Backbone:
């Protein structure tokens, strides 16, 4: 059984599909890091119910800063939050997406703990124009896993 990889045009067997598509998605980061991380989130992760919850939780963090872009309390996404850990941290490609759409991974003091915690903090360059994150949110939510197209291989 043969397939055509939509990202490369390569001819693959049923068992070779994930190996070629995953490679093409990881290489795509050199052209469009946001599109590459979106494909990685849906394509690499087999558990699609967790993928849908992960990208919905990411969409909520992005809309929170969109509602109050002048308030610093919505600029930092806590990587150790109970919800983030279950829905987002369990998936491959979600960290690459945050960095691709203008979030820096930093260590900040906690409001109730001595040990610094991990945050994704939105830069001023992207915060100044919420339209960029709003488009990236829709591009992630409207995405589907990448799968090789079945080649009919018409023969007489």
Residues:
């Amino acid at each position: 059984v043969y397939f055509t990889c939509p990202l490369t045009g390569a001819t693959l067997r049923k068992d070779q599909r994930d190996a070629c598509i995953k490679e093409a998605i990881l290489l795509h980061f050199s052209t469009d890091p946001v599109a590459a991380s979106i494909m990685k989130i849906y394509t690499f992760n087999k558990d699609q119910d967790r993928v849908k919850l992960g990208v919905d939780t990411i969409a909520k963090y992005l809309d929170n800063i969109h509602l109050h872009p002048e308030e610093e309390k919505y600029r930092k996404i806590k990587l150790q939050n109970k919800v983030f850990q279950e829905r987002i941290n369990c998936l491959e490609g979600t960290h690459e997406f945050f960095e691709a759409i203008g979030f820096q991974k930093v260590l900040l003091p906690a409001q109730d703990q001595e040990d610094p915690e991990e945050f994704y903090v939105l830069s001023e360059t992207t915060l100044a124009q919420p339209q960029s994150l709003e488009r990236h949110k829709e591009q992630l939510l409207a995405a589907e896993p990448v799968r090789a197209k079945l080649d009919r291989q018409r023969r007489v």
About this structure: The first strand starts at residue 2 and ends at 4. The longest helix spans residues 48-67. The CA atoms of residues 17 and 146 lie 10 Å apart.
